[PDB]
Symmetry: C5
Subunit: 334 residues, 5 copies
């Protein structure tokens, strides 16, 4: 019997190998299969990957005439001792079990053990949307032992930076993924001790042109369209008056639609400043003609008892101010 | 064997230590890892944390030549006696189990036991939105024993206020978190007895300027824009008439969008009063010109058979009334 | 050992106490902790509560020198016999298990047993929205034994109406809860027999003023605003014409927003009648001026080859009809 | 002991009764408790019901002096042999387990067995929305044995059509349920053999008047309102021009709202044809006046160098065409 | 006993048949039952199917006088050795278990075994929406062994292309399914070795006419309606001015509604180009009349101190440019 060549009943597998002595080293390899989703409101991402472990245990040695290793499944895991890695700062995770548990075990004749499993994990990631939609985000995934400190278990990447592999077809619907690399660091708990921690890092970016076309183009078009009133005859009140209020209504509807399209992040972003500055420009364009009309009526009544200079100066002042605002805005936000 | 140094089979672990005598004291430490989400419609929040227990049991003592403690996992938990803390007023909760159960056990040679586990819990919190968006909310998390009254188990914070730790990077997308502290209180059940309860408290706040810019600015702009009609010549009926109805339409669309953006809380809030008062002002601005036009037509027909005084008085009355309303409103709602 | 004082191995716990004889009485107490949510589309509600059982079993008696009772947990439940209550007309439910099963057992020396557990349940409730938003709903929760008929198990409230307790801070975001009381009734199954059933009843109400302000106010304002056209000079066609169509557009947008705000209940409610009657009034106000203008043009052309009487009669007829409709509507719907 | 009167250890319950001989007949009864929900996008429905089984097994006979039957629970199910019915074409299902498994067993002294359980199941149903909202749907639920063909197990309704019962208060929020009946049929699998299958059928209908009032009324009102322009003086260009474009805008907003209100079924339905035909009529009403105005201007310029006939003919042609379209449409779609 | 004819206790079922020798061949058959849903944001699909396995094991042979095979359930699976197939690139999956596990076993007297189970699986699929709504997508489902390489287990389709069957009533609400076929390929893992993989492929298509009618028709209608202004008298400023701004508002609302209706794919698609080109045309139509009016006013003022040529040329230039754009667009996008 396979479980009789291995002396399962003769050893206490509730304790780590080398109990009471130096720490046992464990090597780790990771292969990333896919990135499933990302949430901007809850600030988390989902990943599916393969996790592998490497260690040696003399209690699992068996006599053999050659180097043929045996293979087992998740049923033997509950009997032998195995590491207890967990994902730090994770929200939820599970191990796939169809059509059975995705667990394998390979034992060398001298006692070397390979332990692999397939897992999906959701982890948190703090994001800053102040520079939206020109922002860039960085995320990380962390692995650590739960029960054993550095004095009992030593955790490291088995092959350095070569221990990380990624699928050729990994992609996201609305982000660009790049710059995968791994690092290590020591963690401290005030009541427990010191622990080793591993990291996997990557970066995300957006598509700029889509957001530009969807947001900045209509606002600029409406602002430029509001300047048309400066060239219409001032005597045509029933034509000059409705144009401004209709432009205001159009801008308000555009802003409402843009707000409805974006995720519910409740603080000021870069796009809001541009939109509301455009709204203020459209607002001032309406008061200009009211002032002009009042002055014309007062002059006519006084006379009773040619282009106005305000239009002539507005035709020059408004585009220059808009260009200056655009220059400052695009110099600040790169 | 580790489970033979501990006399597992020689003791009845179905009863608490010191059964039939004084209550056994248990100490508790908590470390908060993250706040996951918050719901304003269901009135609850989600938290992930570490929970630790401290107690002594002579039945778990083992002989040793030094102070080296043993370490175990969740498999030994089902055999020995452990406390039964639960979260009061919680909706749902679970213990993480990837890649295995996040449970540890450390036993001192003299019988002192440390028991720790990692858990995510969702708890209810009553909220009042009468002062939205200038409201402030307070939340609490409660811990209590389920089966043992104060005559059998005594629960306390092990190190007073030093028993609570929070992560350095805890944050929320739309709230500001502050003022973490712990308290204690006694609870009474009419059919069961008295129990000790522990509390963890914190406060939440919003970003005022975002809501101000998104809501109060356009309404004030539209109200000020409606006053322009008071300065246009009364003889230009086809210019005076459409302006009011278009302003009414714009205000209605703005109110509809604002209502669609907010969560579905079905009672009156502070913002609604401001919005509907602005709507009423815009409404009255339309009836003013109708009265003026009717009076002018009646006068002209009588004569057949200069600014009107109503406009002159409106130009002064409307802004003063709006300023008085703003002063009263901002004095009441701080 | 505790499980040896109780003769667990000497008795067949697969059969109820007093098997083959009279029915065994069981008492029930309930404490309501919170109401979690309510769905108007799926017609269900969620509740969390404590459930307690009382019965006597001589097979669990143990010798003792005093009245000290023993305490156990969910592990002993799988060995002894326990009642099998279930929730009738429920959709889903579960028992909390963090950090362990929320189950307790207390056994008196003479054999009296107390059995308590904590559970969350979702139950259906038929609702009628014909009188929305002035409707009132009544809901109930039902408890019954699954396997044992009244000839084998007798179920009753232990202390009558005093067996129901409710939390002091139970509340809902959009409803008012009142009138908790309990009743009993007998149930019949054609293929199984008769069963006892228990009931918990309560009532729900809404906030009227919020819905009034959000719906009835703008429609009335628009209807009153449409009457302004009756006082404008009939010769100002470019002013009379756009007002009606703009009012129609505003009313249509308001109705669309109100429909989008309400839940998807696909049959006629009270508010829809009011909204569409207002729409019909606004519609007729437009045809009135078309008739007036056609008559004026015909008269002028005939003459070629002062207020119109229609306006004079409309100024009186329209408000009277609207007031009559309001009186009838508010007399029918209380 | 109850489990010793039944010779559990003396029989191999891994094989069906009468193994190697004729098929064993099994009777089935069903009682429907409620219909929980229905999805028009995923095309499925949810149901909760009671399922009962009837068969005889001599291996479960016990000696008794009378006809008193014994009662058991789900614990005995794992030892004795039971049928293996499953729901064909189902997406997900589960058995209720609060406060324990909803399973009962009753065994007669001669070996007759009754087996009942409570289950919730979600099943698919193909739907056709071409005639929306005047469509009618039919759904079915299927029961079949998984492992045993007709040569080993014979499945039938125990009492014919009397085996189906429905709750008195079953209802849906947006559908009308009627015509419950049962049928039987034989199923064939190319690689396994023949199987018996049972069916439960019902029909669903909608509320016509709600959809009529919400959709067809405003479109007809707008189409009739667009005809007003035919009676206004052609010389009033600033009154004739805006009316058409404002009607077009109103119709577009109504269509957008109606599309937003309906579920996301991505193919043409009956309502879309009506809406777009109305839109085309409103579109043509605008080109009519443009042609009239161009002809009038050309005539005036020629003369420089009374109602137009087009209006006179349009006043007759447009309503007749609309009535003909309505007659054809309502004759085709019943 | 059935489990005593099979020598369960006499064999070590932790190792594959023929351990230490040549690979054991396993045959696979699949029957597709239904396609449940498809997500365009998460890029995945859900499928329900039957999975069957074929292999021979001499350790399960039993003596029999005829060719009668025995039948078992999921309880025997935990004792005998079974293959360990899993779904590659899957997100989540489960095995149905109502009213019991959907697992069957049939063993021939000579040791041939049939193993079948029912499973639902969700798998990822990369999609490209650049040609929306004229895009075409291809999807695949993959099956592979987890623990055994090609040197230990050989996987193949049992009957070639005849091993795949599909239900007669499989359909989707918004897609057309076609072209089911199977393929095979070898997979390599750098740290584990080589594996055999199986594929199931199919194609999806959309309904073109629905999207055409919903999107392209109103934009073309609005563009054609904007050309009407070229035929109105230039002296009617209060009629020429509002038409353009109202058309702009209508186009903006249509674009906002279309964007709200589509799924949140954040990059440029084919429809957006058409919509924004139409918007630009409508925008230029407004500047044309502003230029014409300014020139007319300048000429009149100069004279103080007939159709304009711009209109005559625009009437020809605008439709020709629109037709050229349509030809190029529909030649590029087929
Ligand atoms: C590299 C290595 O250790 N190989 C061993 C070798 O010692 C042994 O003799 C042979 C069995 O055939 O293969 C294995
Ligand atoms: C602080 C304390 O109790 N320490 C004990 C000490 O009694 C013992 O002699 C030694 C073993 O080396 O360490 C341990
Ligand atoms: C009320 C009651 O039954 N009390 C019993 C009493 O009989 C017994 O003598 C005593 C032990 O100290 O307490 C207990
Ligand atoms: C209908 C039937 O089979 N009844 C049996 C009867 O034979 C038996 O004598 C009696 C016990 O009191 O009741 C039972
Ligand atoms: C095709 C085949 O192998 N059939 C076998 C046959 O050898 C045996 O004699 C008979 C039992 O009646 O049926 C079985
Ligand atoms: C791994 O490679 C990355 C590439 O950016 C580098 O930053 C990092 O320092 C490397 N780490 C090690 C341990 O070599
Ligand atoms: C803990 O500190 C908080 C800080 O606000 C204080 O309110 C509270 O009383 C302290 N509790 C104890 C037990 O010292
Ligand atoms: C309990 O009190 C309620 C209060 O409304 C009453 O209606 C009911 O009849 C009472 N029931 C009993 C059993 O006393
Ligand atoms: C059951 O009754 C229904 C009622 O419509 C009928 O159609 C059906 O044929 C009946 N079936 C049997 C088996 O009697
Ligand atoms: C199966 O049939 C498909 C039909 O398209 C074909 O492409 C494929 O090559 C065939 N495969 C085999 C193994 O015959
Ligand atoms: C791809 C379109 C880019 C448009 C940019 C507009 C910036 C104002
Ligand atoms: C944080 C600065 C915001 C400024 C917004 C100005 C809008 C007119
Ligand atoms: C609100 C517009 C008033 C314009 C007055 C201008 C006085 C110079
Ligand atoms: C913002 C333009 C102001 C122009 C003022 C001109 C005064 C003669
Ligand atoms: C950061 C913008 C604040 C705007 C406040 C407006 C109050 C009416
Ligand atoms: C609770 C007072 C609400 C007052 C609203 C007034 C709206 C005009
Ligand atoms: C509805 C407006 C009527 C105005 C009448 C004014 C009489 C002084
Ligand atoms: C609200 C302004 C009223 C002004 C009335 C003036 C009467 C001469
Ligand atoms: C609290 C505001 C009530 C408004 C009622 C309006 C009824 C037409
Ligand atoms: C059930 C009667 C509905 C009447 C609606 C009338 C809308 C004009
Ligand atoms: C559609 C309006 C027609 C008005 C005709 C009135 C004839 C008295
Ligand atoms: C609904 C008002 C009708 C008025 C008719 C007056 C006829 C002289
Ligand atoms: C209950 C209102 C029915 C309205 C039908 C309108 C059909 C055009
Ligand atoms: C399937 C025929 C659709 C016709 C739609 C016509 C819209 C003007
Ligand atoms: C686009 C409208 C043109 C009208 C021309 C009519 C020529 C008879
Ligand atoms: C659709 C109405 C056309 C009317 C044409 C009349 C030509 C004299
Ligand atoms: C079935 C209606 C097709 C409409 C196509 C319109 C293309 C501009
Ligand atoms: C990728 C080319 C997009 C061009 C869009 C032009 C919109 C006017
Ligand atoms: C913004 C429109 C200006 C038009 C000027 C035309 C000069 C030839
Ligand atoms: C896009 C049309 C331009 C027409 C220019 C005509 C100059 C005489
Ligand atoms: N390193 C994991 C861990 C367990 C614990 O109690 N504190 O940290
Ligand atoms: N203290 C927890 C608890 C259990 C119970 O039955 N009542 O309260
Ligand atoms: N009283 C519960 C029950 C079980 C059953 O089969 N019918 O009703
Ligand atoms: N009748 C159920 C079933 C099982 C199987 O493998 N094929 O169909
Ligand atoms: N072939 C499945 C698998 C397991 C593993 O560790 N790598 O790939
Ligand atoms: C906003 C422009 C006002 C001009 C006053 C001279
Ligand atoms: C609402 C203003 C009315 C003025 C009447 C004199
Ligand atoms: C709807 C009012 C019409 C009046 C006809 C005299
Ligand atoms: C659409 C109506 C056009 C009329 C041309 C004579
Ligand atoms: C956009 C058209 C402008 C014409 C200038 C001559």
């Amino acid at each position: 019997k396979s479980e009789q060549l291995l002396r399962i009943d003769d050893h206490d597998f509730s304790m780590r190998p080398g109990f009471g002595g130096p720490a046992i080293p464990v090597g780790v390899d990771v292969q990333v299969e896919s990135l499933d989703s990302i949430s901007e409101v809850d600030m988390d991402f989902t990943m599916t990957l393969y996790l592998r472990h490497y260690w040696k245990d003399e209690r699992l040695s068996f006599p053999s005439t050659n180097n043929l290793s045996m293979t087992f499944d998740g049923r033997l895991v509950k009997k032998i001792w195995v590491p207890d890695m967990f994902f730090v700062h994770s929200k939820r995770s599970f191990i796939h079990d169809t059509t059975t548990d995705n667990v394998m075990l390979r034992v060398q004749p001298d006692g070397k053990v390979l332990y692999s499993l397939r897992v999906t994990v959701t982890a948190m990631c703090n994001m800053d949307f102040s520079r939206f939609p020109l922002d860039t985000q960085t995320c990380s995934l962390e692995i650590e032992s739960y029960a054993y400190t550095e004095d009992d278990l030593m955790l490291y990447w088995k092959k350095g930076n070569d221990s990380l592999k990624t699928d050729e077809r990994i992609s996201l619907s609305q982000f660009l993924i790049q710059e995968f690399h791994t690092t290590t660091k020591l963690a401290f708990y005030s009541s427990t001790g010191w622990y080793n921690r591993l990291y996997i890092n990557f970066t995300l970016r957006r598509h700029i042109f889509f957001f530009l076309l969807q947001t900045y183009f209509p606002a600029t078009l409406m602002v430029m369209l509001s300047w048309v009133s400066f060239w219409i005859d001032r005597r045509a009140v029933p034509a000059r008056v409705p144009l401004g209020i209709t432009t205001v209504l159009t801008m308000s509807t555009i802003i409402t639609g843009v707000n409805a399209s974006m995720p519910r992040v409740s603080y000021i972003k870069a796009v809001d400043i541009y939109l509301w500055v455009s709204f203020v420009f459209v607002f001032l364009s309406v008061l200009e003609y009211a002032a002009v009309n009042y002055l014309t009526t007062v002059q006519e009544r006084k006379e009773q008892k040619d282009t106005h200079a305000i239009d002539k100066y507005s035709r020059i002042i408004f585009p220059a101010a808009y260009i200056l605002f655009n220059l400052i805005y695009w110099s600040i936000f790169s």
